[PDB]
Short mmCIF file of C-alpha atoms in Angstrom, two decimals:
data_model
loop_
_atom_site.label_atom_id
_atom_site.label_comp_id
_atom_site.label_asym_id
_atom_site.label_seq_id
_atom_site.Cartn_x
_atom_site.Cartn_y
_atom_site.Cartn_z
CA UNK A 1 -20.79 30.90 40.27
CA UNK A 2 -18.64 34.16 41.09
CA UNK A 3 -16.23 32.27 43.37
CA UNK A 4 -15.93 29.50 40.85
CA UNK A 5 -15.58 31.23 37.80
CA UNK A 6 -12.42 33.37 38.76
CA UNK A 7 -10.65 29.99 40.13
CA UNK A 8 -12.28 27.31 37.15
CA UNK A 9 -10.03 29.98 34.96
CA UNK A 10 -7.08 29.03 36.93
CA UNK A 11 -6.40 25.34 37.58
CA UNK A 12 -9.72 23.20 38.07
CA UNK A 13 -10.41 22.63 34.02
CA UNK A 14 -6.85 21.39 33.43
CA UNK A 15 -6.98 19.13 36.43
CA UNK A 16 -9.61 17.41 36.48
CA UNK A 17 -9.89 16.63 32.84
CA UNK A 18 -6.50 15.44 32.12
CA UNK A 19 -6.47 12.82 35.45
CA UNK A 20 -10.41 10.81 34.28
CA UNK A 21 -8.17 11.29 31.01
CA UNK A 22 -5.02 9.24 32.36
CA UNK A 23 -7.49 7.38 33.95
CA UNK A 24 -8.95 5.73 31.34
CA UNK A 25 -5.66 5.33 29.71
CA UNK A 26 -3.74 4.26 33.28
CA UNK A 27 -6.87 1.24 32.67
CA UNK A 28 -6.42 1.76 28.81
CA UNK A 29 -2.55 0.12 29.39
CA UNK A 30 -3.00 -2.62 32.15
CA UNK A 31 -6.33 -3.94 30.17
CA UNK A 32 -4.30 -4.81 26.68
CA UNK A 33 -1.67 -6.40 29.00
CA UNK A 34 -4.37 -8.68 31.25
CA UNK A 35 -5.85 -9.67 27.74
CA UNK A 36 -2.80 -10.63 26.54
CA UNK A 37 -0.69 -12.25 29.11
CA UNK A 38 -3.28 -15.51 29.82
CA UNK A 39 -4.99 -15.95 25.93
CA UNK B 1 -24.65 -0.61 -41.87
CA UNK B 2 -25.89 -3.91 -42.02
CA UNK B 3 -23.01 -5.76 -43.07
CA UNK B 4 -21.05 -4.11 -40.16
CA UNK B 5 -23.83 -4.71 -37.34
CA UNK B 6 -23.32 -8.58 -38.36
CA UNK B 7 -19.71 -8.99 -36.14
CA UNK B 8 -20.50 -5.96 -34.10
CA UNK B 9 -23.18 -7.22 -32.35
CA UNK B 10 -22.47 -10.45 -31.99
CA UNK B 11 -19.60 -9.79 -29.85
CA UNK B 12 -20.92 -7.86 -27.31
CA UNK B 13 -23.20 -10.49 -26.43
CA UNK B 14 -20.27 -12.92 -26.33
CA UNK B 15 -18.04 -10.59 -24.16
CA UNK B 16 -21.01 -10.10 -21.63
CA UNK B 17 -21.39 -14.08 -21.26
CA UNK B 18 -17.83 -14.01 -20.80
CA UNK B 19 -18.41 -11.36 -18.11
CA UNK B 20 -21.09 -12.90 -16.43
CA UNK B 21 -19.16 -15.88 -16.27
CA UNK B 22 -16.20 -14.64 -14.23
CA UNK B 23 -18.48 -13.06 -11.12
CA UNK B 24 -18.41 -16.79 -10.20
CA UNK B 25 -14.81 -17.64 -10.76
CA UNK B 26 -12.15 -16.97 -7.88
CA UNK B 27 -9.80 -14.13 -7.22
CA UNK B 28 -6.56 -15.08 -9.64
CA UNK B 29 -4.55 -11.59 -9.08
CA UNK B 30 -5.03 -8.40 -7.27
CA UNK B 31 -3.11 -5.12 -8.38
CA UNK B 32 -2.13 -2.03 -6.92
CA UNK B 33 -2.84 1.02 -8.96
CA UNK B 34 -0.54 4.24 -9.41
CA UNK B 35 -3.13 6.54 -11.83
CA UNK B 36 -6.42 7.42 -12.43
CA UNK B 37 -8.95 6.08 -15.41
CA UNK B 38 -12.29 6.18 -15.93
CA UNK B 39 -14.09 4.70 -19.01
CA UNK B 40 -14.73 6.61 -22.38
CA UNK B 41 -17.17 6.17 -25.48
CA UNK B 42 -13.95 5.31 -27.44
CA UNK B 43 -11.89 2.77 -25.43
CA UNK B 44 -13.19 0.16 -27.69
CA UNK B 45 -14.61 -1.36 -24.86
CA UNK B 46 -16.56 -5.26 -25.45
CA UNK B 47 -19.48 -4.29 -23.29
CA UNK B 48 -20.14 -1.04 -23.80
CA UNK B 49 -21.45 0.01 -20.21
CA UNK B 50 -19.89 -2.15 -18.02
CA UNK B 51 -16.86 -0.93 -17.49
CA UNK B 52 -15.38 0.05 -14.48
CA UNK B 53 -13.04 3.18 -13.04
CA UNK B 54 -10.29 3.57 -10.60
CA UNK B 55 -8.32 6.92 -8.77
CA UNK B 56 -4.78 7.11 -7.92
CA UNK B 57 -4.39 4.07 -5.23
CA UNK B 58 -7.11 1.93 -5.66
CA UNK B 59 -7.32 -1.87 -5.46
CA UNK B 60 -8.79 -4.43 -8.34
CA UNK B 61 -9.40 -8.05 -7.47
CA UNK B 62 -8.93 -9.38 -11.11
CA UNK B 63 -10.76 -12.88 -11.84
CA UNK B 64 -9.92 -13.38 -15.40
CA UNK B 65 -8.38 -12.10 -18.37
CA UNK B 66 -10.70 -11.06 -21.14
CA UNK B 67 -8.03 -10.06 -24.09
CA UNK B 68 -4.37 -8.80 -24.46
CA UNK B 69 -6.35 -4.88 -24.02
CA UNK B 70 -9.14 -5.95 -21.08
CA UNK B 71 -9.17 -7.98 -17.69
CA UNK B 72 -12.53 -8.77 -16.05
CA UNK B 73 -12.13 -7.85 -12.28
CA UNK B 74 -13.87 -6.30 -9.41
CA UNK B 75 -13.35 -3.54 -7.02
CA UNK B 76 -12.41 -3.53 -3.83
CA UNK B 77 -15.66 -1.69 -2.02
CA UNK B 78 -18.66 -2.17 -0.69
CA UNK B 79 -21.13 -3.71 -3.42
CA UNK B 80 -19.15 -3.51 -6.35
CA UNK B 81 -19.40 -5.86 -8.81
CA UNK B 82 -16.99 -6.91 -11.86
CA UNK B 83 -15.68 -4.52 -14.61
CA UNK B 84 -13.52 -4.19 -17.38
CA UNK B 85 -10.09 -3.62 -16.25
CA UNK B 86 -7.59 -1.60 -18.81
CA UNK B 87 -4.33 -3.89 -19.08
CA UNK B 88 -1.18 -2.10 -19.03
CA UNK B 89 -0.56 -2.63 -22.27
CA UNK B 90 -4.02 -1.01 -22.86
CA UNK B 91 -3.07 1.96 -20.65
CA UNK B 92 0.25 2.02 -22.70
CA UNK B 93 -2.25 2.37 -25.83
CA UNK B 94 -4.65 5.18 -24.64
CA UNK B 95 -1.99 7.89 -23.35
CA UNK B 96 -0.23 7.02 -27.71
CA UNK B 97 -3.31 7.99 -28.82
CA UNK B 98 -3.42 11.00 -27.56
CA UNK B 99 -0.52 12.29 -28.87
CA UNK B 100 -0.88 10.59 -32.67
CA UNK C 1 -17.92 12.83 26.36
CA UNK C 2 -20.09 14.08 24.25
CA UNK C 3 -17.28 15.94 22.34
CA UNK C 4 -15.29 12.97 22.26
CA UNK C 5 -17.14 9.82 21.94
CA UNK C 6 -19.24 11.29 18.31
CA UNK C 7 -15.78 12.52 17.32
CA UNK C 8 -14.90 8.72 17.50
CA UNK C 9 -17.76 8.59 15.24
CA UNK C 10 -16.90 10.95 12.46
CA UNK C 11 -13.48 8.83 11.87
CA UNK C 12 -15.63 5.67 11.49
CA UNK C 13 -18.39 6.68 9.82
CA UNK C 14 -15.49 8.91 7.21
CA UNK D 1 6.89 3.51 -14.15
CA UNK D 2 4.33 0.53 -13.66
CA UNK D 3 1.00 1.33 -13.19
CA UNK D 4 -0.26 -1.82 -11.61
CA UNK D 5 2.17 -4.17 -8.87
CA UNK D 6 1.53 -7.62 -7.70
CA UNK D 7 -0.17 -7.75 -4.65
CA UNK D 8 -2.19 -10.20 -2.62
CA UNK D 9 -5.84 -10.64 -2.81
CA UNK D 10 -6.54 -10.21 0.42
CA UNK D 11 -4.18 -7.54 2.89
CA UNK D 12 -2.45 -8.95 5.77
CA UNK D 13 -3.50 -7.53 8.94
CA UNK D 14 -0.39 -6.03 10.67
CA UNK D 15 -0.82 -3.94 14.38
CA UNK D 16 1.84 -1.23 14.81
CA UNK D 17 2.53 2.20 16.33
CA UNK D 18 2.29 2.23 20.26
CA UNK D 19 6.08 2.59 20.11
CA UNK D 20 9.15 0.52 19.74
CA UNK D 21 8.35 -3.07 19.86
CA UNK D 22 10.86 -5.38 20.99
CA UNK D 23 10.15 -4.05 24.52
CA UNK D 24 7.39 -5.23 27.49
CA UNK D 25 5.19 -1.97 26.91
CA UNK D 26 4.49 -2.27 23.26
CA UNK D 27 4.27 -5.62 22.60
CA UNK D 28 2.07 -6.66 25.75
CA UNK D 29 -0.44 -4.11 24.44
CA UNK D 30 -0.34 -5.70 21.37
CA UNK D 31 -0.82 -9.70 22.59
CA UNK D 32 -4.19 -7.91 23.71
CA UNK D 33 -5.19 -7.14 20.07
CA UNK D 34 -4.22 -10.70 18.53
CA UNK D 35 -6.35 -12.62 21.35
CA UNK D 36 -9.35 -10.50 20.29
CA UNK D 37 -9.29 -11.14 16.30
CA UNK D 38 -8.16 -14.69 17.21
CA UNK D 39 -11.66 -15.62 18.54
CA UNK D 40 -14.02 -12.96 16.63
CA UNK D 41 -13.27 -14.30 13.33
CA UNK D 42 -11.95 -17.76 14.23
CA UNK D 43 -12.51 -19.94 10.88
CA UNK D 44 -11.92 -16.99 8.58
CA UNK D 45 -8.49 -15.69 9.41
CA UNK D 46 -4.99 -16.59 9.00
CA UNK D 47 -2.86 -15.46 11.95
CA UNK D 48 1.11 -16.07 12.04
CA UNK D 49 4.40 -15.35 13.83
CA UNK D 50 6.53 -13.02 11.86
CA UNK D 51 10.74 -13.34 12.04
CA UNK D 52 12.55 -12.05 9.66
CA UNK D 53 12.66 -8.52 8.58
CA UNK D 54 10.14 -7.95 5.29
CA UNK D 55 11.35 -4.24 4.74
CA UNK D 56 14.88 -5.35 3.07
CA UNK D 57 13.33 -6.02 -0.78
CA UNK D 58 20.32 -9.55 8.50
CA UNK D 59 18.34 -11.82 6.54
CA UNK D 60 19.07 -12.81 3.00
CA UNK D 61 16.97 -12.51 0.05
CA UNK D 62 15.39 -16.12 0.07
CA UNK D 63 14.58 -16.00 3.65
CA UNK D 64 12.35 -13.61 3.11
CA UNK D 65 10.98 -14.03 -0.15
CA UNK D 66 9.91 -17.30 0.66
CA UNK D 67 7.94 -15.95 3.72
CA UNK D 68 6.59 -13.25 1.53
CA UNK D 69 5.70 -15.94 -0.80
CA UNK D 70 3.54 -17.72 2.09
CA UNK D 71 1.54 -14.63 2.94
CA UNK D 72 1.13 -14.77 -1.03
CA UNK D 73 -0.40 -18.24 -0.44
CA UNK D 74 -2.79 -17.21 2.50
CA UNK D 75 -4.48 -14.97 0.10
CA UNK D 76 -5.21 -17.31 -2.11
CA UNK D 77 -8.42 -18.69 -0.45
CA UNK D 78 -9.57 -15.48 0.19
CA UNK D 79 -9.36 -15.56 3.77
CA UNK D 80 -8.19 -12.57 6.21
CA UNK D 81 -4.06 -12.60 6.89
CA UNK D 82 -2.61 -11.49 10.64
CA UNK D 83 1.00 -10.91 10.83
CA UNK D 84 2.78 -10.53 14.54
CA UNK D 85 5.73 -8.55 13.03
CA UNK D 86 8.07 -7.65 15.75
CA UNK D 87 10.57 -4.62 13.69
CA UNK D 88 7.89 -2.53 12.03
CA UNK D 89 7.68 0.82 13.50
CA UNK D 90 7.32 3.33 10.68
CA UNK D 91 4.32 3.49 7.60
CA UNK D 92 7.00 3.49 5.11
CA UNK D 93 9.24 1.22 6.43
CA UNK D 94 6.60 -1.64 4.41
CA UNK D 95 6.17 1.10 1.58
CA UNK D 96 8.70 -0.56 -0.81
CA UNK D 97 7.80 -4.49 -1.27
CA UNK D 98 4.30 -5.77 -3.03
CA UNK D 99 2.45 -6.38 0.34
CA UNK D 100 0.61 -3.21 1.25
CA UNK D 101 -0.50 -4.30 4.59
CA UNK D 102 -3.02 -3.10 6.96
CA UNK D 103 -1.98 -0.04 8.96
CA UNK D 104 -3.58 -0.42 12.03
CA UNK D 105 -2.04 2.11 14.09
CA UNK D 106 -2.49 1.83 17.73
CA UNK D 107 -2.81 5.62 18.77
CA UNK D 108 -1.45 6.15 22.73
CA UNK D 109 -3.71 9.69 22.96
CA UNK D 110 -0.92 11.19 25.89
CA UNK D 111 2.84 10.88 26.12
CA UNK D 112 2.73 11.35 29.37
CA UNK D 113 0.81 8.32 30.23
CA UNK D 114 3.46 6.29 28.28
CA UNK D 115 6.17 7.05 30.83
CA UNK D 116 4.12 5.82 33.50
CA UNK D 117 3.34 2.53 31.90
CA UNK D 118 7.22 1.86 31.95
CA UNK D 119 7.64 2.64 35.40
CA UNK D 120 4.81 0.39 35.64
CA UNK D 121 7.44 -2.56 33.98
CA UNK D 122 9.95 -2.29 36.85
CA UNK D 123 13.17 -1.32 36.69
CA UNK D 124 13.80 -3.18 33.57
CA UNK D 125 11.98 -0.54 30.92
CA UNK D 126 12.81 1.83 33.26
CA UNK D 127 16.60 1.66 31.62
CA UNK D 128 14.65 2.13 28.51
CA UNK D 129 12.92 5.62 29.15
CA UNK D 130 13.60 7.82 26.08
CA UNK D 131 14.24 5.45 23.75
CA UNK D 132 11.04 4.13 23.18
CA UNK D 133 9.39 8.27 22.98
CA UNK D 134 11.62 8.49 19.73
CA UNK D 135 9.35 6.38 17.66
CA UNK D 136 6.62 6.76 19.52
CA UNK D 137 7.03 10.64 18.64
CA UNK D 138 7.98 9.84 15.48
CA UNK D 139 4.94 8.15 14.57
CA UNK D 140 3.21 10.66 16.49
CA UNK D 141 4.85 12.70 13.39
CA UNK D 142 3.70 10.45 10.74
CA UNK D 143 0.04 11.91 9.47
CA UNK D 144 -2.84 9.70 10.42
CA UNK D 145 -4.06 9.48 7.15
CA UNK D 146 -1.14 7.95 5.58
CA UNK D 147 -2.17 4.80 7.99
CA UNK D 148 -5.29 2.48 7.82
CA UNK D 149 -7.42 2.03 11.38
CA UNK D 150 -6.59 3.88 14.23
CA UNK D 151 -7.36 3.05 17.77
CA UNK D 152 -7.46 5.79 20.32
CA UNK D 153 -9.57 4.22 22.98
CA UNK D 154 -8.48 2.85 26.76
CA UNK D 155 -10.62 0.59 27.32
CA UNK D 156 -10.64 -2.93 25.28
CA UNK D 157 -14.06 -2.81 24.38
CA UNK D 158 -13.90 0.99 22.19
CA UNK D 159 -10.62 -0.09 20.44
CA UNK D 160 -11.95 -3.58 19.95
CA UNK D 161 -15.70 -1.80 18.69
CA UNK D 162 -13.12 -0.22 15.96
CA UNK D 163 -11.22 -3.42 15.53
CA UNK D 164 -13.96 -5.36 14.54
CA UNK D 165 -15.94 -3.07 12.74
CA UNK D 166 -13.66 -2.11 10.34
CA UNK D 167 -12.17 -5.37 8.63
CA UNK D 168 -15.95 -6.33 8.76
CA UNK D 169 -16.82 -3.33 6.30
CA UNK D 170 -13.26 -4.30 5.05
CA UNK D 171 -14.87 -7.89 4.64
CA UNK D 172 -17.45 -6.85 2.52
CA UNK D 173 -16.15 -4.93 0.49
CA UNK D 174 -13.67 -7.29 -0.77
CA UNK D 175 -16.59 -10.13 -0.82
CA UNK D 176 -19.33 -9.86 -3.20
CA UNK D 177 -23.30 -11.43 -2.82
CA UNK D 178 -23.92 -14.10 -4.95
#
């Protein structure tokens, strides 16, 4: 806990958050295209 | 008195046939209101009771047209069933009134 | 997700 | 001022607010959303192909009047309306005619993300980089309450959960029991 609570204050909360985030959305803008490019 | 509950009476009952007979009917006209209203003990309203009230920015589904001062209509929500909707000419007679 | 997905429940249900 | 405008008896549907449309991002993430509604409520919608520009009450007047006058006949059997509109970007910019269509706004959660969906087009949105974060920012601007349904959600299902839902409370409220 003591060697990840100085470092989860640095990076580690704004990078892993943000890129299951974009990677919902990266899937979030191919999905409305495979939807809509056969029906 | 008596010889005023004789004409009175009788068309309250013949306004709410005329009201129950419009539920049926389909949607003629919807409108888009700009103010707000809500019914009073004055408005010389047919029915008294069944009339209905609208904010700023509501929607009303009108089915038929009652008189020159009341349209029969519905709101657009969940449930809601038909009312008395003020005409514009009737909401150009209520704000008169309140100046006179 | 579980401050998320009932925050995409209080726009719905409001 | 009038207190009551003519308006149709039944909204027409209209899907706006990724971005600019005229491009490959926006409007192949909104050929998603038509096939969905297509199907779902197949037998109890109205969906059409949009042309001329509706925000000038270019085209003339009778152009499109007379296409304003069909979505005037699609509400008259009380029946949902779809438009594919392919120049509305903006909640005000179909503030002025006697419409008052459906704001679904399609909410993109991350502007960053947006970027990498057009170098995801090729190289032919990638000429087209900043252009499209004007309106996409400026809608970003516009408040979300001014607008109607708003979908925030990657995957199809979540948006499409909204999608449904919605014009199906939407449904009922405009439909009474017997």
């Amino acid at each position: 806990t003591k060697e990840r609570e100085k470092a989860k204050s640095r990076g580690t909360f704004q990078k892993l958050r943000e890129k299951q985030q974009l990677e919902e959305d990266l899937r979030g803008y191919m999905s409305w295209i495979t939807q809509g490019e056969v029906m | 008195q008596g010889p005023h509950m004789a004409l009175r009476k009788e068309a309250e009952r013949q306004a709410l046939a005329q009201l129950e007979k419009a539920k049926t009917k389909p949607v003629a006209f919807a409108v888009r209101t700009n103010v707000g209203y809500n019914p009073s003990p004055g408005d010389e309203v047919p029915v008294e009771g069944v009339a209905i009230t609208f904010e700023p920015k509501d929607f009303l589904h009108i089915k038929e047209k009652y008189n020159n001062d009341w349209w029969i209509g519905r709101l657009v929500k969940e449930g809601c069933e038909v009312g008395f909707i003020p005409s514009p000419v009737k909401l150009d007679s209520l704000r008169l009134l309140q100046e006179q | 997700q579980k401050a998320k997905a009932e925050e995409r429940k209080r726009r719905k249900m409001s | 001022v009038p207190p009551y405008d003519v308006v149709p008896s039944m909204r027409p549907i209209i899907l706006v607010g990724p971005s600019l449309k005229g491009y490959e991002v926006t409007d192949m993430m909104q050929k998603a959303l038509f096939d969905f509604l297509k199907h779902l409520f197949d037998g109890r919608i109205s969906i059409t192909r949009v042309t001329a520009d509706i925000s000038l009450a270019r085209s003339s007047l009778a152009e499109v009047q007379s296409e304003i006058e069909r979505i005037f006949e699609l509400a008259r059997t009380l029946q949902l309306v779809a438009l594919d509109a392919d120049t509305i970007n903006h909640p005000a910019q179909l503030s002025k005619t006697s419409l008052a269509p459906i704001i679904v706004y399609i909410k993109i959660t991350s502007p960053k993300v947006l970027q990498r969906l057009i170098k995801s087009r090729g190289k032919s949105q990638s000429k087209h980089l900043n252009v499209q974060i004007a309106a996409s920012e400026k809608l970003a601007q516009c408040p979300p309450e001014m607008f109607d349904i708003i979908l925030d959600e990657n995957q199809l299902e979540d948006a499409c959960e909204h999608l449904a839902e919605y014009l199906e409370a939407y449904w009922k409220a405009t439909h009474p029991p017997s």
